[model samples]
Target chain A: AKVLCVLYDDPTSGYPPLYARNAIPKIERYPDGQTVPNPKHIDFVPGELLGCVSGELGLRSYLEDLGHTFIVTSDKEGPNSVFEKELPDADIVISQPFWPAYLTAERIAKAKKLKLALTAGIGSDHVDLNAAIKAGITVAEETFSNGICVAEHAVMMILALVRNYLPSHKIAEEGGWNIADCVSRSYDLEGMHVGTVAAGRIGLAVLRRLKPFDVKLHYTARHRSPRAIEDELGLTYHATAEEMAEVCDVISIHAPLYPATEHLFNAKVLNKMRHGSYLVNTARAEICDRDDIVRALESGQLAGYAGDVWFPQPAPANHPWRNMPHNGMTPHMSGSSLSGQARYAAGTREILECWFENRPIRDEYLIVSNGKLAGTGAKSYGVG
Target chain B: AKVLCVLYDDPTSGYPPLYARNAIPKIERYPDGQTVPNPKHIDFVPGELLGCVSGELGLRSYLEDLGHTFIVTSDKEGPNSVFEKELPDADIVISQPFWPAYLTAERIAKAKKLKLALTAGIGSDHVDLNAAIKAGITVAEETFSNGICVAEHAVMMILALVRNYLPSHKIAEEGGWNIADCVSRSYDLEGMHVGTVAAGRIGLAVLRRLKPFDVKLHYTARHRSPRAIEDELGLTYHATAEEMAEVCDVISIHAPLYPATEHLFNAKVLNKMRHGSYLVNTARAEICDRDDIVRALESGQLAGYAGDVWFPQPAPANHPWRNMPHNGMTPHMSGSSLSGQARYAAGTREILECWFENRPIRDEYLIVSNGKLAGTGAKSYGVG
Candidate 1:
């Protein structure tokens, strides 16, 4: 059997081999009480690179010890790329959301020996679930491993946008000390109304992180969260994003992308929001019409927009969001933070250990198994 | 009588005559139960520019009605600057910390008619308290008006530096989607040990805001914070910064800069911090030796440094921090956010009203009155 991994490019600075912090603090468990990823063992420390090509997620020796072949590459795109050339012979495929190996339906058809498609981090959207269901490939992801990571990024983006952080830093970086130029659009987030498009693990964490900031909280999700959580956070539950838009000064999207949520924030929905509302999306990019975001900014309908998700994993150099007015866009690197990569990498190994031993994978980590949507995926995703 | 205000330059984009948002939220009181500024009248909206030269902090028409000459200028440096020329005859001198008018002992001696010195925003360090005391000039500031503002900026900068936000955004802004480039140094702030140099109003607010992020909190201050606060935030109190430096992954400075705190984070203290630990300062620039910070970052003794404070207003193009590696520096504009400007501007009016009506100003706002350190001044500051 062979394991083929698609990792992102190694650091441009060349893997530091020496990290900033000596080690990452062990996150005992998530705020929701799910324990952090626990594999039989981990070969790498928590603060080092694991999602890049040379890192190999600390899995090469383990797989090779079992007499299985392991091939890793950052050459993931293009017809003659290493990933495409190696697909037909691979038994298990592993990739990350930050730099996904898109298993499109056509490519799924081409991978003759592929049995399992495993996401090294959260979000299995890049893998064509509909094709995998028909082809009987077990699809799973490292669920909950990076939820807190994305939540933190979402909260960071909210503060960055409202407070005019990016442009202000640019002024300092470029050697100008123009105070008024930096602060004309800057604001305090203390008393504003903030809401999320979903109230699941990431959304709830965001609300909790924002609670101490003295903001009014709101959420509109597919299903209402428990009453205790609502009351504890003093949340105002909205039945729809439109209702939330009416009151929330800032709205962050945390819901998964499916047919229903596609373009949910197009021109019509965007127009319903307050004139100077801010929008952030870390869950998916297509949730909001990309051009609508641009139009909203140009018309002053949206004061600012920010988040790491983009319609395509590698956004084109000409991606409009890259230069849209008041946008704080970044590449899809939020959940790939070294701390997040540590947990997700370990989670990937746990799933693999189960697969090789013929044991059942954790239900929480299952997206598609036995040729059907199962466990976590059955609740959060749909075949589009 | 004449009033002279030294404000920052007008917005380079020309002060958005139309603001991003219609208005800022109304904050009724500070967390310490201090009420928001109360003035007999206000002439500006809450979300517009008030800290720039052209705005005059919305004080011109009111002062004119009282038959006083008002002068506002951004030129506050050099011997021939407008601020220096106006000092001799100005009955009241007003300025913001963001674009401070340095009231040195020499200037105080030349201001024969100067009776009062007022800070439009918090931090009256630009005014020589010793000179003001000896000259029998009343000195005051808008106490607690922008404490939360600076705290919010501190938290934002902490997250930005730890998550490697500045470089990542620059990659996105410059049309690149290199995930490895963006996240090689990025890490989750969730489990890190974070501490503050002081635990006064701004520092306490920062600790409270970070409580839900699940970071281990620490603080060292001149006086211990209340036991209840310590218990609530699960904080470890350190009597000295060197002790906290040994343990904290990130340290933010919120202490006022007096003789005792000047150069508090020079080479010796910087070495005490764990190699690769982060540092943030929004309090004052001189609290940490400027050149020593550059050395620390270059040597990798400090992984990152970020803040909105500089030793001089309008830092020269050659300022080293402007181009330091792994820096998130910004102009000294945090406390001048539109929301803060509204409150501080109104507070300035209240102080002026008290001066003209021959009524006693609130003790909270007084720094030097009747030739002595008074109220907050006595507790947090000293003649240097």
Candidate 2:
């Protein structure tokens, strides 16, 4: 059997599978929650480890030792991309949201050996769920792997835009001290109304993190949260995004990108938001209209826009959002913190073990099984 | 009577005195928490108003209408500076912490007409307290005007350094999408043992804001906080900086710069901190040895250093911190947000009103009055 993984090229991460050697001690946890082998260090020589696209070596050793071909590549785009070249002979393919290997119907049709697609990190929108189901291929992702991590990033971006941190920090790097210029647009996040477009796990988490800021919280979703949870978080529920935007000075988009969500924040909805308000969208770039966002910023309807996600992975140099005024854009990295990488990496290892043993994987980790949507994939993709 | 004001140059503050005209509506607040004549705009024809060194025009209309000389200048540096040249004739001088006109002993001796030195914003450290007292000149600052603002900045910079936000942001601006490169050094602020050097108002506020991150809080101060406050915040008190440094992964400097506190974060103390730790300082820059901080960053003794305060108001282009690695430095702007400016601007107006009425200025606002320390300044400055 052959397994191919598509991961970003990160020299660090110390991904154990490809880098592990017999000389290193294993880390074990005590019942009292203390970790042993305290002096944690990579004992293996750096050049000795197999370099791969995913930057993960976990699968390399485990699969290669079993006499199975394990291939990895960071290059996933263009006609001669390793992912496209390797798909025909690969039995199982691994990808990540941070640097996704787009799996379309045409690619699926060419992959005769492909039986499973695994997403190393959460959010599997990059894969065409219908195509996977039709092709008798299973799809799964690490559940809740980077929820807290992305939530943290959402909060950071919200604060970054509200406080006008980007321009202020520029003043320091450039060695200037025009306090008025630095602060004329800066403001306090406290005493303002903040809202989330969706109150899912990541959205709810963002609201919970922002509670101490002494701001009024509002949220809208397909279903209302429990009265107790709402009261506990001091959240006011709105029926729709338009209603929420009317009263919120800062609106964070946390809803997943779906057919129902694409272009959800177009000109009409953005116009309802408070004038000179801030918007944070770590969710998906497609959820907002590419041109409308720029127009709003130009017209002063949106004071700032911040996020790590972009319309296309490895955004073009001329991406409008990249050069937009009052922006705090970052590469899609919010969900790939070192700690989050460890969790998703472990989850990937667990799924591979289950698959190799011909045993059932954890149901919660299943996105599509038996040629249909399973777990969150059903609710998220609007099909089963 | 001559009143000389020193402020920054800002074209956007909408300072009523300098920008108001007959055609524009006046801003007024009603008792029921309503604002009227609220379509506020700068009505003075652009370029019609005289521009000055300081950004303040709050006193221009009020003082000029009262038949007093009002002169403002941003040129407060050097021997031939406007502040020094105008000292002999100025009666009351208004300054701001953002661009302080340092009142030295020689300047105080030369200013026979200078009876009051007013800080438009918080922090009267710009004025020589002893000299002001000896010269029977009143030194007053708007207390607590920007405490929350600075506290918010402290939190922003702390996150900026811990998350490696600066490098990640740069990659976005320069058009790069390297997730592994960004996350290799990025970390979650959660679960870290965080500590503060002082637990004053701003420090305490910082602790409160950081509490929800679920970090273990520790602090070293001149005195322990009350038991109830300590229990409520779940604080661990340390008697010495050495004790706190030994355990804290992140140590924020909040202690004032004084004879004893200067260079408190020299090599001796910095070396004691946990290896690869983070340090954030929004207090006076003199508290930390500038060279030691750069050295710490270079040697990997500190993972990152972040702050906005500098030894001098306008850090030179050649300041070491500007070019230091793993730094998230900013101009002296942590306390001068637009919201902060509004509060201090009003406070400055309030001080001017009291002075004109022959009424006693609020004791809490006075740093040195009648040759002695008054109110909070007595305790804060170690004098009474």
> Candidate 1's residue-wise lDDT over A239-341, tens digit each?
9888888898999999887677889888887888888889999989999999999999999899999989997878889999999999988899989999999
lDDT of each: 0.90, 0.76
lDDT minimum window of 10 residues, candidate 2 chain B: B18-27
* lDDT value, residue B340 of candidate 2: 59
lDDT of 2 by residue, A313-372 (tens): 878888889888889888888777665565566677778878888877777778888878
- What's model 1's TM-score? 0.98
- Best-fitting candidate, measured by TM-score? 1
Q: What value of lDDT does candidate 2 attain over all alpha carbons?
A: 0.76
Task: Give candidate 1's fnat, 2 decimals.
Answer: 0.84
**Per-residue C-alpha lDDT of model 1 across residues B1-384, encoded as one tens digit per residue:** 799999988877786546888888989999989999999999998888989878889999999999999999998887799999988999999999888899999999999999999999888888888889999999899999999999999998999999998889989999998888888889999989999998888999999999988999999987888889999999999999888898999999998777888899999889998889999999999999999999999989989999999987778889999998889999998899999999999999999988899998889998989999998888889776
Candidate 2 deviant stretches above 4 angstroms: A11-54, A358-360, A379-384, B11-57
